[PDB]
Ligand binder design. Sequence first.
Ligand SMILES: O=C(O)[C@H]1O[C@@H](Oc2ccc3c(=O)c(-c4ccc(O)cc4)coc3c2)[C@H](O)[C@@H](O)[C@@H]1O
Ligand SMILES: O=C(O)[C@H]1O[C@@H](Oc2ccc3c(=O)c(-c4ccc(O)cc4)coc3c2)[C@H](O)[C@@H](O)[C@@H]1O
Lengths: 116, 115, 115, 116
Amino acid sequence: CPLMVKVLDAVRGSPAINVAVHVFRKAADDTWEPFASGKTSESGELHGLTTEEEFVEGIYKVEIDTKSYWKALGISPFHEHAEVVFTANDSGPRRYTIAALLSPYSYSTTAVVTNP
Amino acid sequence: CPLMVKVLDAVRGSPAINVAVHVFRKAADDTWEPFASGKTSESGELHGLTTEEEFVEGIYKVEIDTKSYWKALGISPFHEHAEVVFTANDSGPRRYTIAALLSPYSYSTTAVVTN
Amino acid sequence: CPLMVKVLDAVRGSPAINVAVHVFRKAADDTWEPFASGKTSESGELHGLTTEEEFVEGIYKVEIDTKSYWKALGISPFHEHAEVVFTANDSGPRRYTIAALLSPYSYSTTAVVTN
Amino acid sequence: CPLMVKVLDAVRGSPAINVAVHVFRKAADDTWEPFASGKTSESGELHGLTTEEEFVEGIYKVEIDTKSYWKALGISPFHEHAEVVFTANDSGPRRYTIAALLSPYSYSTTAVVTNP
Ligand SMILES: O=C(O)[C@H]1O[C@@H](Oc2ccc3c(=O)c(-c4ccc(O)cc4)coc3c2)[C@H](O)[C@@H](O)[C@@H]1O
Ligand SMILES: O=C(O)[C@H]1O[C@@H](Oc2ccc3c(=O)c(-c4ccc(O)cc4)coc3c2)[C@H](O)[C@@H](O)[C@@H]1O
Protein backbone atom coordinates (compact mmCIF):
# COMPACT_ATOMS: atom_id res chain seq x y z
CA CYS A 1 0.00 0.00 0.00
CA PRO A 2 2.00 2.98 -1.22
CA LEU A 3 -0.52 5.72 -0.33
CA MET A 4 -2.62 5.63 2.83
CA VAL A 5 -4.60 8.32 4.62
CA LYS A 6 -5.41 8.31 8.36
CA VAL A 7 -7.71 10.89 9.96
CA LEU A 8 -8.52 11.65 13.61
CA ASP A 9 -11.21 13.84 15.15
CA ALA A 10 -9.96 16.14 17.90
CA VAL A 11 -13.48 17.08 19.06
CA ARG A 12 -14.77 13.53 19.67
CA GLY A 13 -11.43 11.83 20.44
CA SER A 14 -11.98 9.21 17.79
CA PRO A 15 -11.05 8.19 14.34
CA ALA A 16 -12.71 10.40 11.70
CA ILE A 17 -15.06 7.92 10.05
CA ASN A 18 -16.48 8.19 6.52
CA VAL A 19 -14.35 11.12 5.49
CA ALA A 20 -14.22 11.46 1.72
CA VAL A 21 -10.77 11.74 0.19
CA HIS A 22 -9.98 12.67 -3.41
CA VAL A 23 -6.48 12.33 -4.86
CA PHE A 24 -5.33 14.21 -7.95
CA ARG A 25 -2.14 14.09 -10.00
CA LYS A 26 -0.71 17.01 -11.92
CA ALA A 27 -0.85 16.29 -15.63
CA ALA A 28 1.57 17.34 -18.33
CA ASP A 29 -0.72 20.29 -19.07
CA ASP A 30 -0.49 21.45 -15.41
CA THR A 31 -4.13 20.63 -14.62
CA TRP A 32 -5.20 18.32 -11.78
CA GLU A 33 -6.23 14.93 -13.07
CA PRO A 34 -8.44 12.73 -10.86
CA PHE A 35 -6.27 9.88 -9.60
CA ALA A 36 -8.01 7.93 -6.80
CA SER A 37 -10.71 8.43 -4.19
CA GLY A 38 -12.30 6.72 -1.27
CA LYS A 39 -13.61 7.15 2.29
CA THR A 40 -12.05 6.45 5.65
CA SER A 41 -13.10 3.33 7.53
CA GLU A 42 -14.28 2.88 11.11
CA SER A 43 -10.58 3.09 12.06
CA GLY A 44 -10.19 6.43 10.30
CA GLU A 45 -7.99 4.80 7.66
CA LEU A 46 -8.21 4.73 3.89
CA HIS A 47 -6.27 1.92 2.21
CA GLY A 48 -6.23 0.71 -1.36
CA LEU A 49 -6.18 4.01 -3.18
CA THR A 50 -3.52 2.96 -5.67
CA THR A 51 -0.84 0.45 -6.58
CA GLU A 52 2.91 0.75 -6.77
CA GLU A 53 2.70 0.43 -10.56
CA GLU A 54 0.12 3.22 -10.91
CA PHE A 55 1.72 5.53 -8.33
CA VAL A 56 4.42 6.97 -10.52
CA GLU A 57 6.51 10.04 -9.92
CA GLY A 58 4.46 13.19 -9.91
CA ILE A 59 2.89 16.01 -7.92
CA TYR A 60 -0.11 14.72 -6.05
CA LYS A 61 -2.93 16.55 -4.26
CA VAL A 62 -4.78 14.78 -1.49
CA GLU A 63 -8.02 16.63 -0.71
CA ILE A 64 -9.66 15.58 2.54
CA ASP A 65 -13.28 16.67 2.50
CA THR A 66 -13.45 18.05 6.01
CA LYS A 67 -16.45 20.38 5.42
CA SER A 68 -18.70 17.51 4.41
CA TYR A 69 -17.49 15.63 7.48
CA TRP A 70 -18.24 18.37 10.05
CA LYS A 71 -21.56 19.45 8.55
CA ALA A 72 -23.06 15.97 9.23
CA LEU A 73 -22.10 16.32 12.87
CA GLY A 74 -23.98 19.65 12.82
CA ILE A 75 -20.86 21.72 12.99
CA SER A 76 -20.34 24.49 10.48
CA PRO A 77 -16.57 24.43 10.02
CA PHE A 78 -14.09 26.93 8.62
CA HIS A 79 -12.35 25.10 5.79
CA GLU A 80 -13.72 23.70 2.56
CA HIS A 81 -11.25 20.84 2.73
CA ALA A 82 -7.73 20.07 3.88
CA GLU A 83 -5.28 19.87 1.02
CA VAL A 84 -2.00 18.08 0.98
CA VAL A 85 0.15 18.70 -2.08
CA PHE A 86 3.47 16.90 -2.52
CA THR A 87 5.96 15.46 -4.97
CA ALA A 88 6.02 11.67 -4.76
CA ASN A 89 8.54 9.00 -5.75
CA ASP A 90 11.11 11.37 -7.21
CA SER A 91 13.96 9.35 -5.59
CA GLY A 92 12.35 6.02 -6.26
CA PRO A 93 9.22 4.38 -4.87
CA ARG A 94 8.24 5.25 -1.32
CA ARG A 95 5.30 4.46 0.92
CA TYR A 96 3.36 7.49 2.09
CA THR A 97 0.98 7.93 4.98
CA ILE A 98 -0.87 11.22 5.15
CA ALA A 99 -2.13 11.70 8.73
CA ALA A 100 -4.56 14.43 9.61
CA LEU A 101 -6.05 15.73 12.86
CA LEU A 102 -9.28 17.65 12.44
CA SER A 103 -11.04 20.39 14.42
CA PRO A 104 -13.76 22.65 13.06
CA TYR A 105 -11.45 25.71 12.69
CA SER A 106 -8.08 23.95 12.50
CA TYR A 107 -6.34 21.00 11.04
CA SER A 108 -2.91 19.50 11.44
CA THR A 109 -1.34 17.20 8.88
CA THR A 110 1.91 15.30 8.62
CA ALA A 111 3.47 12.72 6.34
CA VAL A 112 5.21 9.47 7.20
CA VAL A 113 7.43 8.45 4.34
CA THR A 114 9.09 5.03 4.37
CA ASN A 115 11.37 3.20 1.96
CA PRO A 116 10.07 -0.30 1.11
CA CYS B 1 -7.42 44.16 7.63
CA PRO B 2 -10.25 41.76 7.04
CA LEU B 3 -7.60 39.10 6.17
CA MET B 4 -4.26 38.55 7.90
CA VAL B 5 -1.83 35.64 7.55
CA LYS B 6 0.65 34.60 10.28
CA VAL B 7 3.32 31.94 9.76
CA LEU B 8 5.48 30.27 12.37
CA ASP B 9 8.46 27.94 12.14
CA ALA B 10 8.20 24.96 14.49
CA VAL B 11 11.81 23.84 13.94
CA ARG B 12 13.42 27.13 14.96
CA GLY B 13 10.70 28.53 17.21
CA SER B 14 10.51 31.73 15.23
CA PRO B 15 8.32 33.66 12.88
CA ALA B 16 8.61 32.40 9.35
CA ILE B 17 9.97 35.42 7.53
CA ASN B 18 9.90 36.22 3.82
CA VAL B 19 7.39 33.48 3.05
CA ALA B 20 5.44 34.11 -0.15
CA VAL B 21 1.67 33.99 0.18
CA HIS B 22 -0.79 33.99 -2.68
CA VAL B 23 -4.51 34.48 -2.26
CA PHE B 24 -7.02 33.38 -4.94
CA ARG B 25 -10.79 33.67 -5.25
CA LYS B 26 -12.87 30.94 -6.87
CA ALA B 27 -14.38 32.28 -10.07
CA ALA B 28 -17.81 31.30 -11.41
CA ASP B 29 -16.15 28.77 -13.73
CA ASP B 30 -14.49 26.90 -10.84
CA THR B 31 -11.06 28.32 -11.56
CA TRP B 32 -8.88 30.18 -9.09
CA GLU B 33 -8.36 33.86 -9.89
CA PRO B 34 -5.43 35.76 -8.33
CA PHE B 35 -6.72 38.07 -5.60
CA ALA B 36 -3.85 39.27 -3.38
CA SER B 37 -0.27 38.32 -2.48
CA GLY B 38 2.67 39.32 -0.33
CA LYS B 39 5.63 38.08 1.71
CA THR B 40 5.55 37.64 5.48
CA SER B 41 7.35 40.27 7.50
CA GLU B 42 10.00 39.95 10.17
CA SER B 43 7.19 39.06 12.58
CA GLY B 44 5.94 36.33 10.27
CA GLU B 45 2.86 38.36 9.45
CA LEU B 46 1.29 39.57 6.25
CA HIS B 47 -1.08 42.50 6.53
CA GLY B 48 -2.81 44.67 3.97
CA LEU B 49 -3.77 41.88 1.59
CA THR B 50 -7.21 43.26 0.91
CA THR B 51 -9.88 45.72 2.07
CA GLU B 52 -13.35 45.32 3.50
CA GLU B 53 -14.83 46.55 0.21
CA GLU B 54 -13.05 43.96 -1.95
CA PHE B 55 -13.27 41.00 0.40
CA VAL B 56 -16.80 39.83 -0.37
CA GLU B 57 -18.39 36.48 0.44
CA GLY B 58 -16.83 33.76 -1.70
CA ILE B 59 -14.42 30.81 -1.59
CA TYR B 60 -10.79 31.77 -1.16
CA LYS B 61 -7.51 29.86 -1.29
CA VAL B 62 -4.46 30.99 0.65
CA GLU B 63 -1.36 29.34 -0.73
CA ILE B 64 1.75 29.54 1.43
CA ASP B 65 5.02 28.69 -0.40
CA THR B 66 6.47 26.54 2.31
CA LYS B 67 8.72 24.59 -0.11
CA SER B 68 10.85 27.65 -0.94
CA TYR B 69 11.07 28.56 2.73
CA TRP B 70 12.53 25.17 3.72
CA LYS B 71 14.79 24.84 0.72
CA ALA B 72 16.35 28.19 1.60
CA LEU B 73 17.27 26.58 4.97
CA GLY B 74 18.81 23.50 3.38
CA ILE B 75 15.86 21.27 4.15
CA SER B 76 14.07 19.07 1.65
CA PRO B 77 10.47 19.40 2.74
CA PHE B 78 7.45 17.26 2.05
CA HIS B 79 4.86 19.70 0.77
CA GLU B 80 4.83 21.82 -2.35
CA HIS B 81 2.95 24.44 -0.42
CA ALA B 82 0.38 24.76 2.34
CA GLU B 83 -3.10 25.51 1.12
CA VAL B 84 -5.95 26.98 3.14
CA VAL B 85 -9.33 26.92 1.38
CA PHE B 86 -12.36 28.52 3.02
CA THR B 87 -15.61 30.37 2.44
CA ALA B 88 -15.67 33.94 3.73
CA ASN B 89 -18.91 34.70 5.63
CA ASP B 90 -20.55 37.97 6.62
CA SER B 91 -22.51 37.44 8.96
CA GLY B 92 -19.93 35.63 11.62
CA PRO B 93 -18.25 42.06 11.59
CA ARG B 94 -15.39 40.33 10.55
CA ARG B 95 -11.66 39.79 10.70
CA TYR B 96 -9.97 36.56 9.44
CA THR B 97 -6.56 35.55 10.75
CA ILE B 98 -5.11 32.49 9.05
CA ALA B 99 -2.26 31.07 11.12
CA ALA B 100 0.08 28.37 9.91
CA LEU B 101 2.72 26.41 11.85
CA LEU B 102 5.37 24.87 9.64
CA SER B 103 7.59 21.80 9.98
CA PRO B 104 9.41 20.04 7.15
CA TYR B 105 6.91 17.17 6.93
CA SER B 106 3.96 18.82 8.63
CA TYR B 107 1.84 21.88 8.89
CA SER B 108 -1.07 22.95 10.97
CA THR B 109 -3.41 25.80 10.19
CA THR B 110 -6.00 27.55 12.27
CA ALA B 111 -8.49 30.33 11.64
CA VAL B 112 -9.24 33.00 14.18
CA VAL B 113 -12.41 34.81 13.14
CA THR B 114 -13.07 37.83 15.37
CA ASN B 115 -14.77 41.19 15.72
CA CYS C 1 7.27 40.88 28.70
CA PRO C 2 9.87 38.17 28.65
CA LEU C 3 6.98 35.62 28.88
CA MET C 4 3.63 35.81 27.10
CA VAL C 5 0.95 33.12 26.75
CA LYS C 6 -1.58 33.01 23.87
CA VAL C 7 -4.48 30.55 23.76
CA LEU C 8 -6.75 29.77 20.84
CA ASP C 9 -9.92 27.72 20.53
CA ALA C 10 -9.90 25.39 17.52
CA VAL C 11 -13.61 24.50 17.82
CA ARG C 12 -14.90 28.06 17.65
CA GLY C 13 -12.05 29.73 15.78
CA SER C 14 -11.61 32.32 18.48
CA PRO C 15 -9.28 33.41 21.21
CA ALA C 16 -9.71 31.36 24.33
CA ILE C 17 -10.83 33.95 26.85
CA ASN C 18 -10.73 33.81 30.64
CA VAL C 19 -8.48 30.75 30.68
CA ALA C 20 -6.51 30.40 33.92
CA VAL C 21 -2.76 30.04 33.53
CA HIS C 22 -0.34 29.12 36.28
CA VAL C 23 3.41 29.37 35.95
CA PHE C 24 5.78 27.44 38.25
CA ARG C 25 9.56 27.30 38.58
CA LYS C 26 11.37 24.08 39.46
CA ALA C 27 12.96 24.46 42.88
CA ALA C 28 16.28 22.89 43.89
CA ASP C 29 14.37 20.02 45.54
CA ASP C 30 12.59 19.07 42.31
CA THR C 31 9.29 20.57 43.39
CA TRP C 32 7.31 23.16 41.47
CA GLU C 33 7.11 26.57 43.15
CA PRO C 34 4.37 29.04 42.14
CA PHE C 35 5.89 31.82 40.04
CA ALA C 36 3.16 33.78 38.22
CA SER C 37 -0.48 33.40 37.15
CA GLY C 38 -3.29 35.15 35.34
CA LYS C 39 -6.33 34.71 33.09
CA THR C 40 -6.25 35.20 29.33
CA SER C 41 -7.79 38.39 28.03
CA GLU C 42 -10.43 38.97 25.39
CA SER C 43 -7.68 38.46 22.81
CA GLY C 44 -6.70 35.14 24.36
CA GLU C 45 -3.46 36.63 25.62
CA LEU C 46 -1.82 36.87 29.01
CA HIS C 47 0.80 39.57 29.42
CA GLY C 48 2.68 40.89 32.42
CA LEU C 49 3.37 37.52 34.03
CA THR C 50 6.91 38.39 35.00
CA THR C 51 9.80 40.81 34.44
CA GLU C 52 13.23 40.47 32.92
CA GLU C 53 14.78 40.72 36.39
CA GLU C 54 12.76 37.85 37.87
CA PHE C 55 12.74 35.55 34.86
CA VAL C 56 16.14 33.92 35.29
CA GLU C 57 17.44 30.74 33.67
CA GLY C 58 15.63 27.73 35.10
CA ILE C 59 12.97 25.11 34.29
CA TYR C 60 9.44 26.47 34.15
CA LYS C 61 6.00 24.88 33.84
CA VAL C 62 3.08 26.72 32.28
CA GLU C 63 -0.17 25.06 33.24
CA ILE C 64 -3.22 26.06 31.23
CA ASP C 65 -6.57 25.07 32.83
CA THR C 66 -8.18 23.79 29.70
CA LYS C 67 -10.62 21.51 31.59
CA SER C 68 -12.47 24.45 33.16
CA TYR C 69 -12.57 26.24 29.83
CA TRP C 70 -14.32 23.35 28.06
CA LYS C 71 -16.63 22.49 30.92
CA ALA C 72 -17.88 26.08 30.89
CA LEU C 73 -18.90 25.43 27.24
CA GLY C 74 -20.72 22.20 28.05
CA ILE C 75 -17.97 19.98 26.72
CA SER C 76 -16.41 17.08 28.60
CA PRO C 77 -12.78 17.35 27.57
CA PHE C 78 -9.97 14.85 27.69
CA HIS C 79 -7.19 16.67 29.50
CA GLU C 80 -7.01 17.94 33.04
CA HIS C 81 -4.88 20.78 31.79
CA ALA C 82 -2.27 21.54 29.16
CA GLU C 83 1.25 21.66 30.49
CA VAL C 84 4.25 23.32 28.86
CA VAL C 85 7.58 22.53 30.52
CA PHE C 86 10.77 24.21 29.29
CA THR C 87 14.16 25.57 30.26
CA ALA C 88 14.54 29.33 29.89
CA ASN C 89 17.86 30.24 28.19
CA ASP C 90 19.79 33.50 28.01
CA SER C 91 21.72 33.38 25.60
CA GLY C 92 19.02 32.52 22.60
CA PRO C 93 17.92 38.86 24.23
CA ARG C 94 14.90 37.20 24.84
CA ARG C 95 11.14 37.03 24.60
CA TYR C 96 9.16 33.76 25.05
CA THR C 97 5.69 33.41 23.57
CA ILE C 98 3.96 30.16 24.49
CA ALA C 99 1.01 29.55 22.17
CA ALA C 100 -1.57 26.85 22.71
CA LEU C 101 -4.35 25.67 20.37
CA LEU C 102 -7.15 23.87 22.17
CA SER C 103 -9.62 21.19 21.11
CA PRO C 104 -11.62 18.96 23.44
CA TYR C 105 -9.38 15.91 22.93
CA SER C 106 -6.29 17.66 21.65
CA TYR C 107 -3.90 20.49 22.12
CA SER C 108 -0.89 21.77 20.34
CA THR C 109 1.69 24.14 21.77
CA THR C 110 4.44 26.11 20.15
CA ALA C 111 7.16 28.41 21.41
CA VAL C 112 8.17 31.55 19.60
CA VAL C 113 11.48 32.76 21.01
CA THR C 114 12.42 36.17 19.58
CA ASN C 115 14.42 39.34 20.05
CA CYS D 1 -4.09 -2.97 25.37
CA PRO D 2 -5.83 -0.22 27.30
CA LEU D 3 -3.08 2.42 27.09
CA MET D 4 -0.96 2.93 23.98
CA VAL D 5 1.28 5.78 22.88
CA LYS D 6 2.12 6.62 19.24
CA VAL D 7 4.65 9.30 18.29
CA LEU D 8 5.56 10.86 14.93
CA ASP D 9 8.46 13.11 13.94
CA ALA D 10 7.44 16.11 11.86
CA VAL D 11 11.04 17.00 10.92
CA ARG D 12 12.02 13.60 9.45
CA GLY D 13 8.56 12.44 8.33
CA SER D 14 8.85 9.22 10.24
CA PRO D 15 7.79 7.47 13.35
CA ALA D 16 9.61 8.82 16.43
CA ILE D 17 11.72 5.81 17.40
CA ASN D 18 13.12 5.07 20.88
CA VAL D 19 11.24 7.84 22.61
CA ALA D 20 11.10 7.27 26.35
CA VAL D 21 7.67 7.46 27.94
CA HIS D 22 6.93 7.55 31.67
CA VAL D 23 3.39 7.18 33.03
CA PHE D 24 2.38 8.33 36.50
CA ARG D 25 -0.83 7.99 38.49
CA LYS D 26 -2.02 10.48 41.08
CA ALA D 27 -1.98 8.86 44.50
CA ALA D 28 -4.33 9.42 47.40
CA ASP D 29 -1.80 11.89 48.82
CA ASP D 30 -1.89 13.93 45.56
CA THR D 31 1.67 13.00 44.55
CA TRP D 32 2.57 11.38 41.22
CA GLU D 33 3.28 7.70 41.63
CA PRO D 34 5.32 5.92 38.92
CA PHE D 35 2.92 3.67 37.03
CA ALA D 36 4.51 2.32 33.82
CA SER D 37 7.28 3.19 31.38
CA GLY D 38 8.74 2.12 28.11
CA LYS D 39 10.12 3.29 24.75
CA THR D 40 8.54 3.58 21.34
CA SER D 41 9.33 0.93 18.74
CA GLU D 42 10.50 1.26 15.15
CA SER D 43 6.85 2.02 14.32
CA GLY D 44 6.74 4.86 16.85
CA GLU D 45 4.37 2.83 19.03
CA LEU D 46 4.54 1.82 22.66
CA HIS D 47 2.34 -1.13 23.63
CA GLY D 48 2.16 -3.17 26.80
CA LEU D 49 2.38 -0.42 29.37
CA THR D 50 -0.39 -1.82 31.55
CA THR D 51 -3.29 -4.22 31.86
CA GLU D 52 -7.00 -3.65 32.15
CA GLU D 53 -6.86 -4.90 35.75
CA GLU D 54 -4.05 -2.52 36.74
CA PHE D 55 -5.41 0.48 34.82
CA VAL D 56 -7.99 1.57 37.32
CA GLU D 57 -9.80 4.87 37.52
CA GLY D 58 -7.49 7.73 38.26
CA ILE D 59 -5.65 10.80 37.00
CA TYR D 60 -2.75 9.75 34.84
CA LYS D 61 0.24 11.71 33.52
CA VAL D 62 1.95 10.51 30.38
CA GLU D 63 5.35 12.20 30.05
CA ILE D 64 6.93 11.84 26.61
CA ASP D 65 10.63 12.57 26.88
CA THR D 66 10.96 14.75 23.82
CA LYS D 67 14.15 16.58 24.92
CA SER D 68 16.12 13.36 25.18
CA TYR D 69 14.78 12.41 21.75
CA TRP D 70 15.80 15.62 19.92
CA LYS D 71 19.19 16.00 21.60
CA ALA D 72 20.38 12.67 20.07
CA LEU D 73 19.50 13.99 16.64
CA GLY D 74 21.66 17.03 17.49
CA ILE D 75 18.74 19.35 17.86
CA SER D 76 18.44 21.45 20.98
CA PRO D 77 14.68 21.61 21.45
CA PHE D 78 12.40 23.90 23.45
CA HIS D 79 10.48 21.59 25.77
CA GLU D 80 11.68 19.33 28.53
CA HIS D 81 8.98 16.83 27.70
CA ALA D 82 5.42 16.68 26.44
CA GLU D 83 2.92 16.00 29.19
CA VAL D 84 -0.50 14.55 28.82
CA VAL D 85 -2.62 14.58 31.96
CA PHE D 86 -6.09 13.03 31.99
CA THR D 87 -8.72 11.27 34.03
CA ALA D 88 -9.12 7.66 32.91
CA ASN D 89 -11.87 5.06 33.24
CA ASP D 90 -14.24 7.22 35.26
CA SER D 91 -17.24 5.92 33.24
CA GLY D 92 -15.93 2.39 33.05
CA PRO D 93 -12.95 0.87 31.27
CA ARG D 94 -11.85 2.50 28.02
CA ARG D 95 -8.97 2.03 25.63
CA TYR D 96 -6.76 5.07 25.21
CA THR D 97 -4.32 5.99 22.49
CA ILE D 98 -2.19 9.04 23.12
CA ALA D 99 -0.85 10.27 19.75
CA ALA D 100 1.82 12.91 19.54
CA LEU D 101 3.46 14.83 16.69
CA LEU D 102 6.84 16.30 17.53
CA SER D 103 8.86 19.27 16.26
CA PRO D 104 11.75 20.88 18.10
CA TYR D 105 9.71 23.94 19.23
CA SER D 106 6.20 22.50 19.02
CA TYR D 107 4.19 19.44 19.74
CA SER D 108 0.64 18.40 19.01
CA THR D 109 -1.15 15.69 20.95
CA THR D 110 -4.56 14.08 20.78
CA ALA D 111 -6.36 11.16 22.38
CA VAL D 112 -8.37 8.39 20.76
CA VAL D 113 -10.70 6.90 23.31
CA THR D 114 -12.65 3.75 22.47
CA ASN D 115 -15.11 1.60 24.38
CA PRO D 116 -14.14 -2.11 24.34
O1 LIG E 1 2.11 1.47 12.41
C1 LIG E 1 1.16 1.00 13.08
O2 LIG E 1 1.29 -0.10 13.67
C2 LIG E 1 -0.13 1.78 13.16
O3 LIG E 1 0.07 3.14 12.95
C3 LIG E 1 -0.98 4.05 13.09
O4 LIG E 1 -0.53 5.22 12.42
C4 LIG E 1 -0.55 6.51 13.00
C5 LIG E 1 0.53 6.97 13.81
C6 LIG E 1 0.50 8.28 14.34
C7 LIG E 1 -0.55 9.17 14.09
C8 LIG E 1 -0.69 10.63 14.61
O5 LIG E 1 0.16 11.07 15.39
C9 LIG E 1 -1.77 11.52 14.17
C10 LIG E 1 -1.63 13.06 14.35
C11 LIG E 1 -1.44 13.61 15.58
C12 LIG E 1 -1.30 14.96 15.83
C13 LIG E 1 -1.35 15.86 14.77
O6 LIG E 1 -1.21 17.26 14.99
C14 LIG E 1 -1.55 15.34 13.46
C15 LIG E 1 -1.69 13.92 13.26
C16 LIG E 1 -2.59 11.06 13.27
O7 LIG E 1 -2.71 9.66 13.02
C17 LIG E 1 -1.63 8.71 13.25
C18 LIG E 1 -1.60 7.40 12.73
C19 LIG E 1 -2.25 3.58 12.39
O8 LIG E 1 -3.37 4.03 13.11
C20 LIG E 1 -2.36 2.07 12.20
O9 LIG E 1 -3.09 1.79 11.04
C21 LIG E 1 -1.02 1.38 12.03
O10 LIG E 1 -1.22 -0.01 12.05
O1 LIG F 1 1.00 40.17 19.27
C1 LIG F 1 0.81 40.14 18.03
O2 LIG F 1 1.52 40.85 17.26
C2 LIG F 1 -0.25 39.25 17.45
O3 LIG F 1 -0.16 37.95 17.92
C3 LIG F 1 -0.96 36.97 17.34
O4 LIG F 1 -0.76 35.87 18.21
C4 LIG F 1 -0.53 34.53 17.83
C5 LIG F 1 0.60 33.86 18.39
C6 LIG F 1 0.86 32.52 18.10
C7 LIG F 1 0.02 31.78 17.29
C8 LIG F 1 0.19 30.30 16.93
O5 LIG F 1 1.24 29.71 17.17
C9 LIG F 1 -0.93 29.55 16.36
C10 LIG F 1 -0.90 28.02 16.30
C11 LIG F 1 -1.14 27.41 15.13
C12 LIG F 1 -1.15 26.05 14.94
C13 LIG F 1 -0.89 25.22 16.02
O6 LIG F 1 -0.88 23.80 15.86
C14 LIG F 1 -0.63 25.81 17.27
C15 LIG F 1 -0.64 27.23 17.41
C16 LIG F 1 -2.00 30.20 15.96
O7 LIG F 1 -2.01 31.61 15.90
C17 LIG F 1 -1.16 32.43 16.75
C18 LIG F 1 -1.40 33.78 17.03
C19 LIG F 1 -2.44 37.39 17.36
O8 LIG F 1 -3.11 36.77 16.30
C20 LIG F 1 -2.67 38.90 17.23
O9 LIG F 1 -3.91 39.24 17.79
C21 LIG F 1 -1.60 39.68 17.96
O10 LIG F 1 -1.78 41.05 17.73
